[PDB]
């Protein structure tokens, strides 16, 4: 019946046209010590989150869920003013990212102390079931993450208080895979640690291009997300032709019931400006919040794909993901 946004609770019946996944703000781990010459300009950094949710209305999109994890400058306030300025529902997590390129030193400590587990189960309910800071604003999703081929000890723990967490709330589940690796492995642990995979998306499966590793994952029952549309090359990343060719393997064996599709933007990077070198450049020209609707749907209608299935992936599926 209702999903905590942070505008406060929405019926899941309003949640309409959906993407499950697109960052209004991000930072990589360390951008805050970098604060005199990365500043954080927020009027600035508003009007282009506010332009991105202008953008994805003109398509149909009612509803955004931001994954940005905790240690990479979540920040509720900020997306409130977002959604308070265009009307968009926007459902935050909370969660850290992976041990990669996370920050993992603060519950590695904890770690020694033996109370990292319970720390992290603790701040999943009071950031679920209380709110975020002195924020008033509730996580609608917690976010998992692993490593490249290894779900770590560290990341071991944030999986296993997840799932004691969703258990106790029914709260979904939103993970992380890097660069095409462990989804079935992610699906495994949590359901060997009771949570309910008709509450998960494994995300990133678009990094992988064997849909053999796709039905392996859809095999626990779980959602999977397409949602990285137009990241190319970077990032261990494969192209969008790789991805759609994947996406109609399944589409064909009837999985759109599992499905979700997402683009994975970075609206406004936290820290220091960059650019980037004008090979990769070019290859990320399609990362903006809209190609889905210009380029990517077009393509799979030209394929012969039905509307409706479609709407089973924006609208049935996240209305079903957030149903109790
Ligand atoms: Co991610
Ligand atoms: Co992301």
Redesign the pocket.
């Known amino acids: 019946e209702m999903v905590e946004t942070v505008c406060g609770p929405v019926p899941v019946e309003q949640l309409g046209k959906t993407l499950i ?1 697109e960052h209004f703000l991000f930072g990589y781990p360390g951008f805050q010590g970098d604060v005199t010459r990365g500043t954080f300009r927020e009027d600035e950094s508003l009007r282009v989150a506010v332009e991105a949710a202008e953008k994805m209305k003109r398509h149909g999109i009612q509803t955004v869920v931001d ?1 940005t994890p905790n240690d990479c400058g979540r920040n509720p306030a900020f997306l409130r003013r977002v959604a308070e300025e265009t009307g968009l529902n926007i459902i935050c997590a909370t969660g850290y ?1 992976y041990e990669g390129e996370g920050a993992p030193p603060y519950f590695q400590f904890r770690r020694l102390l033996g109370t990292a587990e319970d720390d992290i189960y603790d701040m999943f309910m009071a950031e679920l079931t209380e709110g975020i800071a002195d924020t008033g604003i509730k996580a609608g999703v917690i976010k998992l ?1 692993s490593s490249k081929g290894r779900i770590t000890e560290y990341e071991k723990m944030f999986f296993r208080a997840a799932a004691r967490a969703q258990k106790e709330t029914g709260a979904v589940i939103i993970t ?1 895979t890097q660069e095409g690796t462990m989804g079935p492995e992610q699906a495994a642990y949590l359901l060997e640690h009771g949570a309910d995979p008709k509450k998960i998306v494994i ?2 499966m678009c990094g992988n291009t064997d849909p053999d590793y796709h039905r392996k994952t859809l095999a626990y029952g779980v959602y999977i997300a397409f949602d990285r549309f137009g990241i190319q090359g970077m990032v261990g990343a494969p192209t969008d032709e790789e991805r759609v060719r994947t996406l109609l393997a399944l589409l064909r064996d009837g999985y759109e019931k599992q499905i979700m599709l997402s683009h ?1 933007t970075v609206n406004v990077w936290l820290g220091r400006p960059f650019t980037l070198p004008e090979p990769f450049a070019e290859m990320m020209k399609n990362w903006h919040v809209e190609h889905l609707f210009v380029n990517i749907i077009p393509a799979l209608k030209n394929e012969g794909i039905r509307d409706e299935v479609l709407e089973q992936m924006f609208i049935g599926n996240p209305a079903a993901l957030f149903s109790a």
Do not use: E, I, S, V
Request: aromatic share 12%; hydrophobic share 10%.
């Open positions: 996944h994954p990212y993450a992380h995300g990133h994975d």
